[PDB]
Design a protein around this ligand. Structure first.
Ligand SMILES: O=C(O)Cc1ccccc1Nc1c(Cl)cccc1Cl
Ligand SMILES: O=C(O)Cc1ccccc1Nc1c(Cl)cccc1Cl
Ligand SMILES: O=C(O)Cc1ccccc1Nc1c(Cl)cccc1Cl
Ligand SMILES: O=C(O)Cc1ccccc1Nc1c(Cl)cccc1Cl
Ligand SMILES: O=C(O)Cc1ccccc1Nc1c(Cl)cccc1Cl
Ligand SMILES: O=C(O)Cc1ccccc1Nc1c(Cl)cccc1Cl
Ligand SMILES: [Cl-]
Length: 583
């Protein structure tokens, strides 16, 4: 809800620590290249202004919107001109256009330095000033992930500070904290990906897509709840995500906290797993709620055919109350299959909807849609062979070889895409093998659909930033939930025109020899992509031959006395072997 003085309302509701953290995340995400200390100064200003309005809400400016107050502060910054180019034209503008402009310049691949944990340095900053150290975490993560779910980031900052509580007085510091940080990293990065999808769903596919996703998710977590209660939570959760995805972080966090309280107050009718969550403080409580994945299927439920195929009013309901009805389908399907991937459940609803659009026009609709559930069950099973084949490949060759097989597959599909993006995405796809292939047989498909949804959304976000392939555009935009089928269906892109081999220009040198081992692995994956960009029709056996040659040449020359000399002499020999091989 809104108050006359929104700044006072949210300061009152959130309290000063969380208010400050949230405002710092806002500024970090709007202005990702700006330094920490400049952000801190604006947050302090606004905080101090907040306190003025709490004490006297009649004070000048206290009835301004949050965007006005945020924006005026962003426009103090002189360097907006230098550091952002045509974004200081946001500052030239006034609200509500200004805020929109700022939002549009969030950068999904800002290319800041890779963060590296240095235990002694970190421990000393923690000692010096814990609050600054917390703030610095919020800043560094937020600016790398400009749609990170902001109240979840506050929870993670508290966990981060806890790692250093534990480890800094420990004798051996890095032994204690490096693995903690590694673990936290993978969890934060997963969280950012799941939120980036949520935000894509609303931004690119509309509020109705986000509602659809929410009804499916919530029905797997709280399947014993009634539809009217699930739908209440959907309405609230949808408002929360809309706010967070739009950069309305103070409202997001406040509404989130209210929704956590509602959930906990109604825990007996929603899920027994809430018992672990509901006596925690707000941020941890909310995180715990988010972490719940599923409950048991309620006993004694009727077949879905009753409401969705037998009922004489199926067409009526589809026609007159379409959103409610598709919502009910989602709730009822989801609650019966709480282990399914959400994207699959949505894929089913979409086909159900398509079935009704075709059949409800006919003289005997029921004749036409009576068997729709059998078609849906088949749709669930469609990719089981290929998933099995993928997991068999992973088992036979391991993660790095599985990534290599994916580089080939994906480069053929989308050869226009940049080499760093093809490598990033293919390595992430290969990690799906490790995360999913030793799940129970029956849990593999939902595992792989879930991660694929996240990884392909990353692809699509990177592609939006600089579009290069009509086929990737098409798959990214045709339908959010059928992205995985779309991309799987793509074949070699014959639209692509390869540039010739720069046959006189040989491009590899002895500085490869000193790389850390994982960087040596990436260098070989980069080489593979480039080989495919020059000879996009090469066979698997050809690419293997050439890559084998390449790695023997690198090993031979990195072990030589004169290393660069070997690269220079034998490099031309490599190009010759390669040519003969790619005929
Ligand atoms: O304010 C303090 O006492 C500690 C401190 C030191 C350096 C930088 C920031 C902060 N605190 C702080 C932070 Cl970490 C973020 C936003 C607003 C404030 Cl006041
Ligand atoms: O490592 C990342 O890419 C982000 C990330 C997520 C969770 C925890 C830490 C980090 N990065 C990071 C590192 Cl590597 C060191 C010190 C402080 C930070 Cl925020
Ligand atoms: O729209 C809302 O705020 C919640 C609501 C309540 C009852 C029925 C449908 C909906 N929303 C909704 C919509 Cl608009 C589309 C697909 C799935 C759902 Cl749950
Ligand atoms: O791509 C396919 O045809 C099979 C398929 C279906 C559902 C989910 C994932 C996958 N494939 C797949 C798998 Cl199983 C793991 C890692 C990367 C990919 Cl592309
Ligand atoms: O030498 C280069 O990097 C460019 C070039 C020119 C002619 C023939 C092949 C290549 N590159 C090349 C070779 Cl020779 C082997 C494996 C991977 C690559 Cl990218
Ligand atoms: O030398 C080899 O053949 C192993 C190798 C090294 C670097 C890059 C790729 C490959 N192998 C390879 C190739 Cl070229 C394609 C698909 C799957 C695999 Cl394992
Ligand atoms: Cl949440």
């Amino acid at each position: 809800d809104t108050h006359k003085s929104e700044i006072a309302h949210r300061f009152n509701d959130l309290g000063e620590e969380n208010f400050q953290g949230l405002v710092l995340i806002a500024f970090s995400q709007y202005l990702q290249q700006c330094p920490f200390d400049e952000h801190v100064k604006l947050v302090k200003e606004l905080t101090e202004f907040a306190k003025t309005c709490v004490a006297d809400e009649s004070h000048a400016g206290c009835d301004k919107s949050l965007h006005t107050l945020f924006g005026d502060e962003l426009c103090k910054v002189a360097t907006l001109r230098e550091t952002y180019g045509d974004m200081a034209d946001c500052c030239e503008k006034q609200e509500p256009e200004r805020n929109e402009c700022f939002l549009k310049h969030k950068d999904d691949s800002p290319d800041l330095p890779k963060l590296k944990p240095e235990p002694d340095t970190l421990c000393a900053e923690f000692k010096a000033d814990e609050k600054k150290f917390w703030g610095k975490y919020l800043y560094e993560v937020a600016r790398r992930h400009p749609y990170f779910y902001a109240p979840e980031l506050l929870y993670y900052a508290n966990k981060y500070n806890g790692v250093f509580q534990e480890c800094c007085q420990a004798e051996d510091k890095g032994a204690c904290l490096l693995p903690k940080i590694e673990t936290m990293r993978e969890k934060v990065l997963a969280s950012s990906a799941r939120q980036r999808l949520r935000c894509a769903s609303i931004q690119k596919f509309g509020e109705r897509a986000l509602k659809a996703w929410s009804v499916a998710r919530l029905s797997q977590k709280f399947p014993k709840a009634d539809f009217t209660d699930v739908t209440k939570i959907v309405t609230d959760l949808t408002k929360v995500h809309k706010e967070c995805c739009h950069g309305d972080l103070l409202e997001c966090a406040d509404d989130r906290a209210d929704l956590a309280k509602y959930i906990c107050d109604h825990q007996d009718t929603l899920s027994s797993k809430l018992k672990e969550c509901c006596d925690k403080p707000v941020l941890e409580k909310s995180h715990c709620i988010a972490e719940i994945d599923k409950d048991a299927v309620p006993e004694n439920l009727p077949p879905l055919t009753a409401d969705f195929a037998e009922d004489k009013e199926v067409c009526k309901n589809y026609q007159e109350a379409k959103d409610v009805f598709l919502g009910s389908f989602l709730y009822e399907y989801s609650r019966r299959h709480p282990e399914y991937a959400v994207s699959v459940l949505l894929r089913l609803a979409k086909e159900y909807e398509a079935t009704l659009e075709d059949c409800c026009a006919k003289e005997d609709p029921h004749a036409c849609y009576a068997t729709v559930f059998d078609k849906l069950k088949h749709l669930v099973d469609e990719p089981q062979n290929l998933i099995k084949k993928n997991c068999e490949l992973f088992e036979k060759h391991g993660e790095y070889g599985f990534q290599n097989a994916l580089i080939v597959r994906y480069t053929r599909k989308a050869p226009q895409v940049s080499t760093p993006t093809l490598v990033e995405i293919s390595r992430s796809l290969g990690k799906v093998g490790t995360k999913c292939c030793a799940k129970p047989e029956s849990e593999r498909m939902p595992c792989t659909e879930d991660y694929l949804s996240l990884i392909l959304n990353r692809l699509c976000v990177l592609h939006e930033k600089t579009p290069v392939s009509e086929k990737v555009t098409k798959c990214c935009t045709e339908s959010l939930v059928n992205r995985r089928p779309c991309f799987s269906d793509l074949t070699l892109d014959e639209t692509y025109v390869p540039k010739p081999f720069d046959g006189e220009s040989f491009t590899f040198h002895a500085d490869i020899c000193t790389l850390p081992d994982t960087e040596k692995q990436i260098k070989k994956q980069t080489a593979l992509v480039e080989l495919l960009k020059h000879k996009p029709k090469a066979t698997d056996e050809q690419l293997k031959t050439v890559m084998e040659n390449f790695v023997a040449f690198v090993d031979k020359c990195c072990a030589a006395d004169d290393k660069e000399g070997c690269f220079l002499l034998e490099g031309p020999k490599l190009v010759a072997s390669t040519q003969a091989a790619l005929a």
